[PDB]
RNA sequence: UUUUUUUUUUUUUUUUU
RNA sequence: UAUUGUGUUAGCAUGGUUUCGAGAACA
RNA sequence: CGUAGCUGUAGAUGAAUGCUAAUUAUAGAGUAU
RNA sequence: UUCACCUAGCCAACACGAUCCGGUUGUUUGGGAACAAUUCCCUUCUAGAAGGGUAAUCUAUGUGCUAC
RNA sequence: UUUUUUUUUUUUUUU
RNA sequence: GGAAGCUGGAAGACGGAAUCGUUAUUAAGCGCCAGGUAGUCCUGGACACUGAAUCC
RNA sequence: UAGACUAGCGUUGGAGCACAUUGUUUCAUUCGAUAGUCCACGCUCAAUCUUACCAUAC
């Protein structure tokens, strides 16, 4: 049993009886949700703005189809936690079984480059 | 003596229809939906058109066609060895009836929309 | 034997039998019923209600 | 997750120590009063305002 | 509706009970209620609407994750804390993958309806040949006791 | 001589290793369902190597008053000798244990 | 006054080593060196407890 | 279900549920 | 007491160049200690290739039907070289590879000719690292917000059963 | 036909553990058997320390009451006994605070319970000549 | 309406692990009656619920070919009570738990 | 006698420089922490590419055939940000609650039953002690012919007894008693809203 | 029954650009 | 809520608990 | 519930059930003919 | 609960324990046998065709043969 | 039951 | 690892000799599940029906 | 006065587990010997862990 003669004569009780539609309530929720979660909402930002794999140097890197090479290969690799950032150099074909990691490893290769060059000649070249 | 359905003449594999009078086991359900694929595809409106070859009537009776039907039908009546006592298999018509009615497959007897039911 | 029969001595006493039927109502008596009707304006606790 | 954890005996190196210093403090604070009156205080000093 | 700006709704809050809580005596006497437990103590019943804030842009992935929300909230066996974490990590793994429009095309072409005579790709894969003795290969560069060479 | 004090088991490396896997699986229990959900939606069956070391099946029954991993029931959680000593010490009488019946 | 509880199984083991420490003959230098750091001090008087 | 006793039980059980399984050998 | 996995009893991805993992006359490793990964060592290479031109009419028809087709059949190659070894051409060439520190697994190998090409391209590859550093700052701001979390409801929460409401 | 003699046969061999009215018992015994040893080892030890210093024992208790409540509510003249110290031990069993008004521990507002100085009915009653484990501090000896 | 409710019935059940313990409860419950304000006290009906039992099996001394077995019987007891027209909730709920 | 012959430490060559310098591989003891969401996604991409490379199995093609069957019948999420409203929250918004204890919400008899566990202090909680159901007789409830049929159709014949003519509605989707009790009262009112149509 | 917080390759871990 | 090494020579002929094999219990 | 009773077939000289190009189910993984 | 009563008729790998011995006494990744003649054919490729080999002995248990 | 049915039986229960 | 379709010319009608024991709801047949904490036995544990004979 | 006799009835093949001869860098340390603490031993279940063994290295 509900008496409609009292709600019509008072505005305070009219609001309680009135049931706003879900559309009106949903509009306010969007604003509140964005304000609280200001530092969240985007997950994958390495979209085609820079095309994945590599963008600086592409094509004819390691495909053993012809003599000599043409260009190098450089790109970034996502860490296991998704917060760190490191470069990459190694690229065999798509899968990249071997990764050279950041320039920390590449620096040692240049230092050791002359050592191996003089050793391979006397290792098995003459036999 | 060796009747099918036991003392209570159980039937946990047949589905009744609201319209007309015709029933069939779940074995024929797979063949009916595959054969009437042209009507289903046109109702909604390549990867999507993958089962087109299976619509052939003669292909189903070949060695290749026999294996395709058996693959989809997993024989729900058969289960683990530990499913004994109160843990017994029930009628699987509940799932079959939903798919048969949602797909809007015509009945062989009379061309009608979803009219199937459990029975 | 007397040590094991201590429980029976208290039960036989008529003084303790009078206070057995006088205790506090468990909380899980009317609380479940209140939630059924869906009312958010009642408190079971007497001190908090006041 | 919670079903497999219920196995073996519990830890033994986390029992309460029998310290004499804590025994005296418990006895001293055992006879404390109960001046809560959370409900009575609210009603008190209110009837005069209505009058 | 104004009781909580972060949850604009008509009925969200209930009433608290007077049921005793805590341990009579243990190493956790001063525990009471947890940080997350206090929230449900003043609510009619828990829900799963807080998680739904951002969903994948892809239509296929949006429906797959959305359906799980309606079923998880009406299932017994999952804890309140686990429910939030289950869906929070699901939206992230889906966003780190190629769109479903491309996944189906690759799988459909690489998995035809009918098999072939050489589609297994596994040949001469005997058991008692490679990894069942015959004392042969050691995957090891530095070896003092060379067993392969000694024999 | 002196029957063991059944409240505190002796040292056992293998016994402690079994309990270690229980904690790892509980924390990773949520990740197990995510791996199955992604494959089911895409319609592809594949292995989950990460579940080998944190799988539920890695854990097996073990004797608390012991360290053997055989002859343990889910009701008593004890071996043949564990139940005999516990029952003969006068501890199951309160829990409704009448040895008169066969 | 402090009295740390210890495993009952460890109590009997402590006396076993101490009884034969200054009474019987113990062979091996490692046994004496390692045995002089677990049962030489009372559990309650130890500086660190696991 | 290795012997002819337990193995035949499965076929007979399905016969009472509204299915027909060939019987014949084993 | 059967095996755990059956994948170990199968040949994985082709390495292009076949090198004998167990060394016989290998030198001593140097450096590569702090990193503890991808050690450098010298070995002997052996290149191998197949050119299906000299095959007979009987076997060439079946071989091409499996290689140049919609999908691979029988790995797109014939069985062991029982009779095709005549057309097989292989040239010995010294090469090197890398191995894991603890795992001790082969990663890949490079030809001697390709090794010299890397030295000549040092100036070209060194300058390419500068371009990556430019985008380091730009990607930091976008990759930091890659963590979806539920909206916090508690707000240092109230006790809003009925009272308080005038307190609000 | 014996009906009462065959009672419980159905729920002995044709019932599941998770589909029956039988409740587990190992859970309760886990926390009960361990607490028995705690009261035995720490029981006599606590009483010995309390009785170590007969006189001057009430001075420490009297001074402590002047810091918590300030005013000594239990103050009495020199011609009246103050209190009697009872050797108590802490509770180790993680009991649940049930709403039972007739319970003996649900209304516990402290983490200490009294200990019986003498018992005539030992709870761990053996069924034979076997002794209780962990009740032999001194190692054994052989004739040799 | 909450004020329009009334306790129609209150089925009280017991679960005892010993014969002597169950007998003590019956005597205690009877003593609590015949003491209320109304002329006739609430007299609930009796309804036994059988006596479930359980007994696992184990092989029996180790290093044997399973020549003998030892069983461990674990009996149980149950009891159920019925109530009708419980006008006084305090004089019934308190008596049952006490 | 046996299992005692020790061996000298033969690992002393200068070549073995990369030893005892870094922590061993990941151990099972350190696996207590959970896997971050970045690593779980990486494994999916690595495995999907390997299977298509040619690593096929006899039991792999059968799984794909079953998935394609559900596509034709229309039981897939395949389409040729969003902020939705959960069904639970929608019911809360649309609910006419009573204004105080003296107001009757429903207009028909109903019985509420729930099991409450009482006893000595148990170290662990007893499960299966949070059930709540409501029963009502259809004959007593006055309704039209069309409305009466719909009541039994929505709930089905399982929740209806043909002997006495009563309908029992049970709801248990929460562990707590208070949470479950309130849930039953919300769905009950919603059922009557749709029945009368 | 309610649809959007920002975003550059054929080279989506298969192509001689 | 994990926490005091060894799943190794040495048990019938010196062993604590348990038990298989043979024999006995009457006035 | 099984051999039922009852009742059709061949009142079996020929009813042995293992071998396997191939699928059903559990499982993270049981694969190749 | 014959907790009884003799043992030329027991395990040191369930556990405690007399004496000798002390394997960074643990852990990461793997293995732990019984079954080879390769996708065999100038007749063929986006609707089915031709070849698969260790015969050495015991104990305890399911399953089969019976009428001219 | 001359407008009645249209049929084999189990290992806890009408307290 | 378990089960199923199809296919079917695996090795057996030998011996009335001999060795393992049953104190009758015994023996001989047939049918069902409870536990073994995913599947996973012809053994062990456990219930029910038909149920003959002899000088023991 | 048991076994001995009088009824019924399971076997000299093909198959599952296990002991043993012959293989093994590892094929699980073993009980008991002839009426049995001998063959699913403390295998009331071994496809990873259960697993003690060998290889490899921290």
mmCIF file of C-alpha atoms in Angstrom, chain A residues 3-74:
data_model
loop_
_atom_site.group_PDB
_atom_site.id
_atom_site.type_symbol
_atom_site.label_atom_id
_atom_site.label_comp_id
_atom_site.label_asym_id
_atom_site.label_seq_id
_atom_site.Cartn_x
_atom_site.Cartn_y
_atom_site.Cartn_z
ATOM 1 C CA UNK A 3 -0.279 6.785 -0.701
ATOM 2 C CA UNK A 4 0.308 9.166 -3.621
ATOM 3 C CA UNK A 5 -1.329 12.150 -1.848
ATOM 4 C CA UNK A 6 1.813 12.829 0.247
ATOM 5 C CA UNK A 7 4.593 12.424 -2.338
ATOM 6 C CA UNK A 8 2.922 14.978 -4.659
ATOM 7 C CA UNK A 9 2.895 17.618 -1.881
ATOM 8 C CA UNK A 10 6.593 17.157 -0.998
ATOM 9 C CA UNK A 11 9.678 17.330 -3.210
ATOM 10 C CA UNK A 12 12.068 15.583 -0.811
ATOM 11 C CA UNK A 13 10.119 12.294 -0.917
ATOM 12 C CA UNK A 14 9.542 12.621 -4.701
ATOM 13 C CA UNK A 15 13.246 12.139 -5.436
ATOM 14 C CA UNK A 16 13.367 8.840 -3.538
ATOM 15 C CA UNK A 17 10.310 7.494 -5.405
ATOM 16 C CA UNK A 18 11.688 8.604 -8.766
ATOM 17 C CA UNK A 19 14.087 6.034 -10.250
ATOM 18 C CA UNK A 20 16.656 7.588 -12.621
ATOM 19 C CA UNK A 21 17.324 5.595 -15.792
ATOM 20 C CA UNK A 22 20.555 3.622 -16.168
ATOM 21 C CA UNK A 23 21.674 5.959 -18.997
ATOM 22 C CA UNK A 24 21.932 8.950 -16.650
ATOM 23 C CA UNK A 25 23.801 6.952 -14.003
ATOM 24 C CA UNK A 26 26.221 5.432 -16.536
ATOM 25 C CA UNK A 27 27.245 8.886 -17.802
ATOM 26 C CA UNK A 28 28.462 9.943 -14.345
ATOM 27 C CA UNK A 29 30.317 6.660 -13.787
ATOM 28 C CA UNK A 30 32.544 7.225 -16.863
ATOM 29 C CA UNK A 31 33.803 10.573 -15.520
ATOM 30 C CA UNK A 32 34.481 9.183 -12.032
ATOM 31 C CA UNK A 33 36.260 6.064 -13.348
ATOM 32 C CA UNK A 34 38.652 8.087 -15.579
ATOM 33 C CA UNK A 35 39.477 10.552 -12.780
ATOM 34 C CA UNK A 36 40.500 7.807 -10.331
ATOM 35 C CA UNK A 37 42.369 5.707 -12.942
ATOM 36 C CA UNK A 38 44.171 8.642 -14.599
ATOM 37 C CA UNK A 39 47.418 6.681 -15.142
ATOM 38 C CA UNK A 40 45.685 3.632 -16.686
ATOM 39 C CA UNK A 41 43.666 2.687 -19.766
ATOM 40 C CA UNK A 42 46.289 2.060 -22.493
ATOM 41 C CA UNK A 43 48.041 -1.301 -22.661
ATOM 42 C CA UNK A 44 49.467 -1.753 -26.155
ATOM 43 C CA UNK A 45 50.998 1.488 -27.412
ATOM 44 C CA UNK A 46 53.645 -0.206 -29.685
ATOM 45 C CA UNK A 47 50.922 -0.178 -32.343
ATOM 46 C CA UNK A 48 51.931 0.584 -36.022
ATOM 47 C CA UNK A 49 52.870 4.257 -35.138
ATOM 48 C CA UNK A 50 56.179 2.425 -35.120
ATOM 49 C CA UNK A 51 55.554 -0.923 -36.958
ATOM 50 C CA UNK A 52 56.625 -3.889 -34.724
ATOM 51 C CA UNK A 53 59.667 -5.977 -35.589
ATOM 52 C CA UNK A 54 61.849 -3.072 -36.899
ATOM 53 C CA UNK A 55 61.367 0.274 -38.726
ATOM 54 C CA UNK A 56 64.865 1.789 -39.011
ATOM 55 C CA UNK A 57 66.417 -0.952 -41.201
ATOM 56 C CA UNK A 58 64.266 -3.640 -42.847
ATOM 57 C CA UNK A 59 64.915 -6.240 -45.555
ATOM 58 C CA UNK A 60 67.919 -8.402 -46.449
ATOM 59 C CA UNK A 61 69.464 -8.725 -42.965
ATOM 60 C CA UNK A 62 70.260 -12.411 -42.339
ATOM 61 C CA UNK A 63 68.397 -14.345 -45.075
ATOM 62 C CA UNK A 64 71.243 -16.478 -46.479
ATOM 63 C CA UNK A 65 70.124 -16.106 -50.133
ATOM 64 C CA UNK A 66 73.050 -14.104 -51.562
ATOM 65 C CA UNK A 67 76.659 -13.124 -50.883
ATOM 66 C CA UNK A 68 77.443 -10.344 -48.393
ATOM 67 C CA UNK A 69 74.934 -8.211 -46.472
ATOM 68 C CA UNK A 70 73.268 -4.843 -47.242
ATOM 69 C CA UNK A 71 72.205 -3.223 -43.945
ATOM 70 C CA UNK A 72 72.110 -3.775 -40.195
ATOM 71 C CA UNK A 73 69.196 -4.536 -37.842
ATOM 72 C CA UNK A 74 68.143 -2.649 -34.712
#
